[PDB]
Design a protein around this ligand. Structure first.
Ligand SMILES: Cc1cc(Cl)c(-c2cc(C(=O)O)c3[nH]cnc3c2)cc1F
Ligand SMILES: [Zn+2]
Length: 343
């Protein structure tokens, strides 16, 4: 039952001290690269974007994966939507800006900026090579710790129209809160071909996770302890284990913590009351997350949390057989009392 899930979470709590030291190994490399990129004309206004829990600047995507986001303040920015994709945009300017070396008429080239960014990193990684670190931009600190670095364009302007019906937290976190979060900046990340940038809102996650209840006092006292974070921790861990178990057959390579997070938060909108997340119902709640995620896998529909018209589970992004492989693996883990959590 819930007892089994609790022992998994307690096991995960002890490995938190090893990924706090690993977060430090990542922070040293990132601070070294930041003062290196800041001396450059193009990356003069480069800064670190705080997205997670460790130092705020470092995030976690898998047992050894780390996510770092380098922001770049881009004032006087005009966005042009690409072929009604709702998430992808061309970057255009409204004077003598430092970003001028990557322009092609009016369109700011993503590949041209990511080339200079990647080269400076590849250059200082060989400079301070007395700390084992090798190669959007992925590094590997001491044959174990993997770190994915992302160059983001910060826009302090209002969120584009595609987001209007996104962040449906009004009935959970409130309308007052949605308005305040929508006052925060948004980020543009190069696309994974065209010179387009994708809307990123990863920085908003830390805001909601540390203030996740309908009640302001959620998880501040024993009498109001919910199982929201625990369901996300268990949903994330389930995929990490499945990805490790089938790293041999490549079908789970496209699926990430991002898909697990999106689906979990959609269940938060679905279940806005803290009573729908009681700590005694850990098993029941985790299953509702598993069921919605399996419904997403089967229907080939997982909506971006900030852009409803953008499908993360589109045939274009992830193939149907990759989705059916995860559907049958999870369905099995559900029908075998989760043996991937065996200890
Ligand atoms: C409630 C909520 C839910 C989600 Cl899913 C995200 C979020 C968004 C992006 C993004 O690119 O837009 C992510 N990219 C990597 N992890 C990400 C997490 C932020 C939130 F505030
Ligand atoms: Zn809570």
């Amino acid at each position: 039952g819930a007892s089994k899930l609790r022992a998994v979470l307690e096991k995960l709590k002890l490995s938190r001290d090893d990924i706090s030291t690993a977060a430090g190994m990542v922070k040293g490399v990132v601070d070294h690269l930041l003062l290196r990129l800041k001396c450059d004309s193009a990356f003069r206004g480069v800064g670190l974007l705080n997205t997670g829990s460790y130092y705020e600047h470092v995030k976690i995507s898998a047992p050894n994966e780390f996510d770092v986001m380098f922001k770049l303040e881009v004032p006087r920015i005009q966005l042009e939507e690409y072929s009604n994709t709702r998430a992808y945009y061309f970057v255009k300017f409204k004077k003598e800006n430092p970003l001028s070396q990557f322009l092609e008429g009016e369109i700011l080239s993503a590949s041209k900026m990511l080339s200079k960014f990647r080269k400076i990193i590849k250059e200082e990684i060989n400079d301070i090579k007395d700390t084992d670190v090798i190669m959007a931009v992925t590094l590997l600190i001491s044959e174990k710790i993997s770190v994915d670095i992302t160059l983001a364009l910060e826009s302090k302007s209002s969120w584009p129209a595609s987001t209007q019906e996104g962040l449906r937290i009004q009935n959970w976190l409130s309308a007052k809160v949605r308005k305040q979060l929508r006052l925060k900046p948004f980020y543009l990340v190069p696309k994974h071909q065209e010179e387009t940038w994708r809307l990123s809102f990863s920085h908003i996650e830390k805001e909601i996770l540390n203030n996740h209840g309908k009640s302001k006092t959620c998880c501040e006292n024993k009498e109001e302890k919910c199982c929201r974070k625990d369901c996300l921790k268990l949903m994330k861990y389930l995929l990490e284990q499945l990805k490790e178990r089938f790293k041999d057959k490549k079908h789970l390579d496209k699926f990430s913590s991002y898909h697990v997070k999106t689906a979990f938060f959609h269940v938060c909108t679905q279940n806005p009351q803290d009573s729908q997340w009681d700590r005694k119902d850990l098993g029941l709640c985790f299953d509702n997350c598993v069921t919605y995620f399996l419904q997403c896998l089967r229907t080939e529909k997982l909506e971006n949390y900030f852009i409803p018209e953008f499908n993360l589970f589109s045939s274009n992004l992830i193939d149907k057989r990759s989705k059916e492989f995860l559907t049958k693996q999870i369905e099995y883990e559900r029908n075998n009392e989760f043996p991937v959590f065996d200890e």
